[PDB]
Design a protein around this ligand. Structure first.
Ligand SMILES: COc1cc(C(=O)O)cc(C(=O)O)c1
Ligand SMILES: COc1cc(C(=O)O)cc(C(=O)O)c1
Ligand SMILES: [Mn+2]
Ligand SMILES: [Mn+2]
Lengths: 335, 335
């Protein structure tokens, strides 16, 4: 009877798959090409993945039922539509969002959905964000860290965040591989991926957002970070302590709040890929129990262990209910 | 009467200062030049820092006395001698280590010392490490993350680690600014420094060391990381979980232990710059109480708050004693 709403659950659609299959044959130097060739390539190292990402009502729903999971909140899998040229990305975002709405509508008690967009073209992405919010009535938004090797402090993306803030939709900033600004250090030992690169790429993006003052410009933004907040909850004291030096000697702009206060006000986190009771308890302690959500990270992680992690969490039942689904129901407006 | 041994306490000596003053005028593109110009430059934004780093027996000792701090474990301040050419770095490491040994000998109940080296020349560095251990009999070693924009998984540095392992001295890997591999993303909002770049640079170095299998080659190495382990303690579950993918699809070498097992076996951490009781408790829980040490990070942080942080830590008195000084006395050979 614990209501479980999993918040970082990947899906894909045939038009996006086809575009990535084509993209896999190009000489794109993005570090995401490792993943793209592994999953979408002509000789894939991970040949079952397209099928598992594409499936919603077969194995996925069967696994949900066997583990007592009420819902998946679906998101177009990284790297979404962000690797394509602007026209292509804009077209495919629309298509993927329409298909997400269609998927959710077939089983709305079991699936909710996040829309995505192509920030390669900020003006067009702003229009699509508005369409996602008001015409499709999806539950929120998802984007995969950097676009065009730029981070979201860049004023280039202001029209995107203006539209997101106005829409009231939370934005899940999911990882992708380290951008070209930092990828040189992530070429070895599989560090391009979830084992290290994903967290460094995504957390650096979010820290730039905070320190740049994005949340003074757009104070009603809600951002969600998976992987126990990409470790930002662990760094809060030092982010705050060193901020004086940053604005005094480092040219950082003066902010209305402390870095950690933006993190608690404007961000929430999920437990995707971090099935640690100690890290969960730490995060609840420093963020508050309203700011932590459960996730599986299916199909990149299996459902049973993630479910058992939350069902056995050494926290009171009321807090467990918040983490398991209550918070997600609030943040992603799930009835 | 808690015995307090602070383990990340920076010092400098005139010959190194003079060399950095000269270096500040060069066209070196290293991100450390920001700090170097701010402290050692002809028109320094932080003019009092050289005096504070240079002082051992004046203000530093008075502050130790007024706060009841037993000892500082001294280290040549970042970037140490690593920015110089090999000949210069090698020469200056010898001098700086002799001066460190003399500083310690002058007040051995109040100061312990870490020797440094210039890994620009691994053969010469290996010889200096041996001298530090056997002739100077210093308490350990210190190096500031990368050298020549390479990380310590590189076989280029094997003679260094062979020598460190044989010496039995622990190596404190202190931060410096992000290397050229990653520095593009750390040029804004003061992120070059302790607020973010230091942690990403140093943790990525350490993660490369672990995933490369360095600790299978040299299983007796002891490495110390400040700033609450540069957040690696927070990432342990995910580092372990994703390791199968890394070795299966990512070309990472198979290891004898799990990544988190190398971290507990071969690393210890300090609390420098992270005066959070929650983060301290988390670290003691996941690493064990023997693996956590207290530090101040003087003169970049003030002593009083660091001292009051540990004196008021909500942990049992025997564990507090271990963290405050007992572990340091073991790891750094202090009577
Ligand atoms: C492309 O999307 C992915 C996402 C995750 C994640 O940690 O969120 C992991 C993988 C992966 O394991 O390769 C891939
Ligand atoms: C030159 O070495 C430094 C070290 C630290 C540290 O956090 O360990 C901070 C600063 C700084 O605040 O600029 C400088
Ligand atoms: Mn994911
Ligand atoms: Mn320091």
């Amino acid at each position: 009877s614990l209501r479980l709403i999993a918040t970082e659950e990947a899906v894909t659609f045939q038009p996006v798959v086809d575009a990535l299959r084509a993209h896999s044959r190009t000489d794109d130097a993005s570090l995401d090409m490792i993943l793209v060739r592994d999953v979408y390539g002509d000789e894939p190292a991970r040949p079952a993945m397209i099928g598992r990402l594409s499936d919603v009502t077969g194995e996925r729903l069967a696994e949900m039922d066997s583990n007592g999971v009420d819902m998946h909140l679906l998101s177009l899998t990284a790297p979404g539509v962000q690797m394509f040229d602007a026209e292509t990305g804009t077209r495919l975002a629309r298509i993927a969002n329409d298909l997400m709405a269609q998927t959710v509508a077939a089983n709305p008690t079991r699936f909710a959905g996040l829309g995505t967009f192509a920030p390669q073209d900020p003006a067009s992405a702003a229009r699509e964000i508005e369409r996602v919010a008001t015409q499709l009535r999806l539950n929120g938004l998802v984007i995969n860290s950097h676009t065009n090797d730029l981070y979201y402090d860049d004023p280039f993306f202001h029209p995107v965040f203006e539209a997101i803030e106005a829409s009231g939709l939370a934005l899940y900033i999911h990882p992708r591989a380290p951008s070209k600004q930092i990828d040189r250090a992530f070429r070895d030992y599989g560090m391009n991926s979830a084992i290290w690169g994903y967290g460094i790429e995504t957390s650096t993006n979010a820290v730039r957002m905070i320190l740049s003052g994005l949340f003074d410009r757009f104070p009603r933004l809600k951002i969600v970070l998976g992987h126990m907040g990409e470790a930002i909850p662990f760094w809060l004291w030092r982010l705050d302590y060193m901020h004086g030096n940053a604005t005094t000697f480092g040219g950082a702009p003066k902010l209305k709040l402390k870095p950690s206060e933006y993190f608690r006000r404007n961000f929430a986190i999920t437990t995707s890929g971090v099935e640690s009771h100690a890290a969960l308890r730490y995060s609840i302690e420093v963020l508050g129990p309203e700011n932590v959500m459960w996730a599986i990270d299916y199909p990149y992680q299996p459902m049973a262990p993630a479910v058992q992690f939350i069902r056995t969490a050494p926290i009171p039942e009321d807090v467990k209910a918040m983490v398991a689904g209550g918070n997600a129901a609030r943040i992603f407006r799930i009835t």
